[PDB]
């Protein structure tokens, strides 16, 4: 989980995007229902780019932006 490069481009894409500057619970644009395959394919993406697996403490309940981010941060490569 190198973190930042792939955390960026900016969510690629801005596909899993911190448009908010609001704390991790609010998601790609997601946290009342969202688009599934965006999240899925990008956590697929993140899976591979960050090359790890994720218990739910280091998850901290990944809504898949700043929490997976802070995870990958806490993880590091």
Curated annotation (Swiss-Prot):
* Swiss-Prot/TrEMBL keywords: Cytoplasm, Fatty acid biosynthesis, Fatty acid metabolism, Lipid biosynthesis, Lipid metabolism, Phosphopantetheine, Phosphoprotein
Q: Domain named Carrier: which ranges?
A: 1-76
Could you give a GO molecular-function term held by this entry?
acyl binding
Chain positions found as O-(pantetheine 4'-phosphoryl)serine: 36
Chief location: cytoplasm
Q: Does the keyword Lipid biosynthesis apply?
A: yes
Which interval of the chain is the signal sequence? Answer: none
Q: Which PROSITE patterns match?
A: CARRIER, PHOSPHOPANTETHEINE
In which domain of life is the source organism classified? Answer: Bacteria
- UniProt pathway annotation: Lipid metabolism; fatty acid biosynthesis
PTM text: 4'-phosphopantetheine is transferred from CoA to a specific serine of apo-ACP by AcpS. This modification is essential for activity because fatty acids are bound in thioester linkage to the sulfhydryl of the prosthetic group.
Listed GO CC annotations: cytoplasm; cytosol; membrane
Described function? Carrier of the growing fatty acid chain in fatty acid biosynthesis.
Kindly give the HAMAP family that the UniProt entry links to this protein.
Acyl_carrier
The subunit field of the Swiss-Prot or TrEMBL record says: Interacts with MukB.
Write the protein's name: Acyl carrier protein
